[PDB]
């Protein structure tokens, strides 16, 4: 619910899990879905540093 301004953007951290991007690829109000460098369809096969 609470979001901050761009002048004070903050970051997060993600640790060891097993998380699936298939649910993240479901339909939503996302107007833009653009990743450059990695195919957006093979994202659920590799381990990430």
């Amino acid at each position: 619910t609470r979001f901050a301004s761009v002048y004070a953007w903050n970051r997060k951290r993600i640790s060891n899990c097993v998380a699936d991007y298939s649910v993240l690829y479901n339909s939503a109000s996302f107007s833009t879905f653009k990743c450059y460098g990695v195919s957006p369809t093979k994202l659920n096969d590799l381990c990430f540093t």
């Binding site: 990695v38 195919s39 369809t41 093979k42 590799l46």
Partner: protein, 49 residues
């Protein structure tokens, strides 16, 4: 990591590089192998005489 429609300009940058590295080796070997045949005849006429 990529898609066949996209992973087709990053293979043609490797093929043309790895192919223009064998013909140089073959050409240099061809030039070098014609200098042993110029001694294998001197050593043959130095035995009959």
């Amino acid at each position: 990591r990529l898609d066949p429609p996209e992973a087709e300009v990053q293979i043609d940058r490797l093929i043309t590089g790895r192919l223009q590295s064998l013909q140089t080796y073959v050409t240099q070997q061809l030039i070098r192998a014609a200098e042993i045949r110029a001694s294998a005849n001197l050593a043959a006429t130095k035995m009959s005489e």
